[PDB]
Chains A and B, each alone.
Chain A
């Protein structure tokens, strides 16, 4: 951008991503489920595609860390800030980091990895925080009961599509 690195949107439709490391909290296979289900949420509303990688540098480098972890924004231990992400662009951009100090769960009994990844990925794609409390892009983790009926706020749809267009 003007001062900090990063671009408004990815200049390509077919993105690649990698789950760098894993959180002990949950079985490796369950992390894959949460992350992937998370990414799908945005593929359905756009012409975007996501290919998983296991080596090399993907666009979206997903990883778990605690306290100091490389970038200029160390995590705050248990509670408060659960995760952060970067906007589209080269290098660390698009990446998403997760606070391991939190209790990651694939169900409604902890901090739902899916819900958070879905939110963070929105940033990797170029979205900002929403004021609409019903919008996924609202920063405050609102944990919903039955996961099966999770739905995107129209607002997020209008948001992500105004960038990448709707599916063809």
Chain B
């Protein structure tokens, strides 16, 4: 499985639930050979209130059975550690993959935290962050912000991903705006 990860904002908009939780158990094949599931302890839920969850409705995060086919692989030492899992809902189940935005909450910049808690929604319905795969990138509609990180330094967690957000500014115009915090 190979993939281009999403910018946190796109992670927030396109996901069905943006939960905060701790990984309670090691992967086990549930009622299907196709997916492996992790028992999780959900603390805070930033998105997906059309699925409740409160503190214990979502107790399992699914992902494919094998890495080659996009299964997510979690390996942390402290189980009480908290993560930001942005995932989709196949049926009524939270799914995650190799690309799914999963990072420990404490590693998240103050800006990113603020975006997840309040600002990303603002850019969902209209703006759309587009990841540049080369140097001339690609001019897109005014509502697309050119995610030009990686190309410099070669990383999944650059500046635009740690301090910037793609918010609207004029009809048909979306802009990279800073979310200081």
Binding site for B on A (CB under 8 A): 3-4, 6, 71-73, 79-87, 103, 108-111, 116, 119-120, 123, 128-129, 133, 139-145
- Mark out the residues of chain B between 131 and 181 whose CB falls within 8 Å of any chain A CB in the assembled complex: 131, 133-136, 150-151, 154, 156
Q: How many A-B residue pairs have CB under 8 A?
A: 93
Q: Chain A's interface: helix, strand, loop or mixed, by majority?
A: loop
User: Can you name the residue of chain B whose Cβ is closest to the Cβ of A71?
Assistant: B69
Nearest-Cβ distance from residue B85 to partner chain A, whole angstroms: 15
Nearest-Cβ distance from residue A82 to partner chain B, whole angstroms: 5
**Chain B contact residue count (CB 8 A cutoff):** 29
User: Can you name the residue of chain B whose Cβ is closest to the Cβ of A96?
Assistant: B68
Q: Is B78 an interface residue when CB atoms closer than 8 A count as contact?
A: no
Judging by beta carbons under 8 Å apart, are B66 and A139 in contact? no
Docked pose: A6 CA to B68 CA in angstroms: 12
Nearest-Cβ distance from residue A2 to partner chain B, whole angstroms: 9
Docked pose: A142 CA to B150 CA in angstroms: 7
Given contact pairs A109-B134, A129-B73, A141 touches B66 in the complex (Cβ within 8 A): no
Docked pose: A6 CA to B67 CA in angstroms: 13
Q: Is B115 an interface residue when CB atoms closer than 8 A count as contact?
A: no
- Residues in B with CB closer than 8 Å to A109 are 133-136
- Residues in A with CB closer than 8 Å to B68 are 84-87, 123, 128
Judging by beta carbons under 8 Å apart, are A85 and B1 in contact? yes
Nearest-Cβ distance from residue A129 to partner chain B, whole angstroms: 5
Q: Per-residue 0/1 for B118-138: is the Cβ within 8 Å of any A Cβ (1 yes, 0 no)?
A: 000000000000010111100
Nearest-Cβ distance from residue B65 to partner chain A, whole angstroms: 5
Judging by beta carbons under 8 Å apart, are A81 and B98 in contact? yes
